[PDB]
A paper describes a structure:
Rhodesain is the lysosomal cathepsin L-like cysteine protease of Trypanosoma brucei rhodesiense, the causative agent of Human African Trypanosomiasis. The prodomain interacts with the active site of the protease and keeps it in an autoinhibited state until it has been successfully trafficked to the acidic lysosome lumen.
To prevent autocleavage and to stabilize the proenzyme, we introduced a mutation into the active site of the protein, C150A. Here, we present the 2.8 Å crystal structure of the active site C150A mutant of the uncleaved T. brucei rhodesiense cysteine protease pro-rhodesain under acidic conditions. The proprotease structure contains two parts, the N-terminal prodomain (residues E38 to T123 according to uniprot numbering, ID.: Q95 PM0) and the C-terminal core protease domain (residues A126 to P342). The first 18 amino acids belonging to the prodomain, a short loop between the first two helices (residues 77/78) and residues G124/R125 at the C-terminus of the prodomain, are not resolved. While the overall architecture of pro-rhodesain agrees with related proenzymes including human cathepsin L or C. papaya papain, pro-rhodesain displays a unique extended α-helix covering the entire cleft between the L- and R-lobes of the core protease domain. However, and so far unique to pro-rhodesain, a bulge forms around residues N103pro and G104pro, whose backbone amides are not involved in hydrogen bonds. Importantly, this bending of the α-helix enables the guanidino group of R100pro to interact with the side chain of Q144 in the core protease domain. In contrast to the continuous α-helix observed for H3 in pro-rhodesain, the structures of all other available, nontrypanosomal pro-CathL proproteases display a mostly unstructured peptide in the C-terminal end of H3.
Author numbering: 38 to 76, 79 to 123, 126 to 348
Write the structure that this text describes.
Amino acid sequence: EMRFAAFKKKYGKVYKDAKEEAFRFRAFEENMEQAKIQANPYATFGVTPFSDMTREEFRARYRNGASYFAAAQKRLRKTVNVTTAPAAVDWREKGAVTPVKDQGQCGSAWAFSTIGNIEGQWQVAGNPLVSLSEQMLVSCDTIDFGCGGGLMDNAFNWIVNSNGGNVFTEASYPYVSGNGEQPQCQMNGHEIGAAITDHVDLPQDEDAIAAYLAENGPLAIAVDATSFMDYNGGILTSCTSEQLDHGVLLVGYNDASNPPYWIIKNSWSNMWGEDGYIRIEKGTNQCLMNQAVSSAVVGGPENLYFQ
């Protein structure tokens, strides 16, 4: 019970009354209880920022998400061929990944997946790495549902087809939905951080995805997040893989490991997992990561062989 107080003191949790805290502790107890059930064996599980909440709300927080992906799955995805694969790449070292962020009490992970992907593709184009705005998407993308959820595909389409291929920087358009508030769209007072021309979807092939990632940079993926709750670190190997319900970002992989793994960036700050990051086994479709991979396309200047 000391480690629950440690938890409270670590995340500044100030409960309403005895009753509200009462469950959170029972709930904390059960989350710690379940954490030793999953104890992906070769990964670590423990206390995270949501050991306070129950796995009925968690699974409820995704009910919408699940239903958006299932609806997207029913529609035709145009896959793009991959020209074809280094045993290991990791775009974090290659300055193609920004510090981890926090979606807060907002169902806005779709927006974080999109922004993260865009940032990676923009930097791999050969631009200076630059944080970009999720708020833009959360408040201004009328295809999607802001804190209610959305699809990366919808948002790629909104940027290109309703915002000229333009993405505003985080600095100029700051993330303020952390608290679940949804202010009106603000078109003025922003600086454009990046430009996209289109987006592509990728086939449901992990080998294919890796080659395009290795070649082009971080991609927006969707996973089943059910096994993510109590994760502290390691490589997941029995990820629950039943229903897609969360948008994350694939930043790399490594084949020279036993077993090999994908490197994924999440929108739950850094206090969660491996500094905001999770590793899942590659090549067995863990968390169904291959089902909804997609990537913005960067073009622009082409003076490579002209100077």
